[PDB]
């Protein structure tokens, strides 16, 4: 469904799923330094199986 | 009263004579119960972890002081 497109459910070559890290996006910061670049790359696929069902056609 | 308290964790994560890898977290402790021997580093929360690969060795002093070290495997 049209939300997950520009937001990352993103699919890879292996048909795996990219979300990364939410730790603090915009409001509520001012704590440490590696939490901030702690904005990440990483995901589990347990909830990928039903994830990309939303992104299915325009992956 | 109704304050359900907390989960915490602790425990000793890698036991004696276990082959660990460089970066393995060895013990989760509160203060320093187990003290860092040769091969072993200690973080903020007083966690003990491994700087190299090898057999894990426990050192006991009569309690009151303890140690964890790493004997190389190779």
């Amino acid at each position: 469904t049209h939300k997950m497109a520009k937001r990352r459910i993103k699919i890879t070559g292996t048909g795996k799923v990219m979300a990364f890290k939410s730790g603090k996006r915009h409001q509520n910061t001012g704590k440490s330094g590696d939490e901030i670049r702690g904005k990440g790359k990483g995901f589990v696929l347990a909830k990928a199986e039903w994830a990309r069902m939303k992104l299915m056609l325009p992956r | 009263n109704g304050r359900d308290s907390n989960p915490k964790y602790l425990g000793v994560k890698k036991f004696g004579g276990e082959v660990v890898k460089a970066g393995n977290i060895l013990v989760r402790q509160r203060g320093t119960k187990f003290k860092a021997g040769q091969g072993v580093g200690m973080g903020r929360d007083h966690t003990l972890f491994a700087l190299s690969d090898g057999k894990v060795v426990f050192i006991n002093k009569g309690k009151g002081a303890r140690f964890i070290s790493i004997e190389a495997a190779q």
Binding site: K6, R7, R8, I9, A19, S22 | -
Partner: protein, 92 residues
């Protein structure tokens, strides 16, 4: 709604512009004739898709004489077309 789809922190920016048709060197060299491709033969050469311009990149590495007319190509692809001799044309 709220099961780990929202609560997930992305924006990015959507564009998805010009997309080139991939033509492997590995295809062009090795087999066939070096038929002097241009944009003509691509129809029958099993590179026929269209809708988009055509682009050449290096994949398989082999020496041959070849001359290819595409819309654009990569650096090492240029290098590999010239190293075994040849040319790659581009419009202005």
């Amino acid at each position: 709604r709220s099961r780990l789809i929202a609560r997930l922190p992305k924006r990015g920016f959507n564009n998805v512009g010009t997309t080139y048709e991939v033509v492997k060197l590995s295809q062009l060299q090795d087999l066939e004739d070096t038929t002097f491709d241009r944009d003509t033969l691509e129809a029958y050469r099993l590179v026929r898709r269209k809708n988009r311009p055509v682009k050449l990149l290096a994949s398989g590495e082999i020496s041959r004489a070849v001359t290819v007319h595409v819309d654009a190509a990569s650096a090492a692809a240029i290098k590999a077309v010239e190293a075994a001799g040849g040319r790659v044309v581009l419009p202005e």
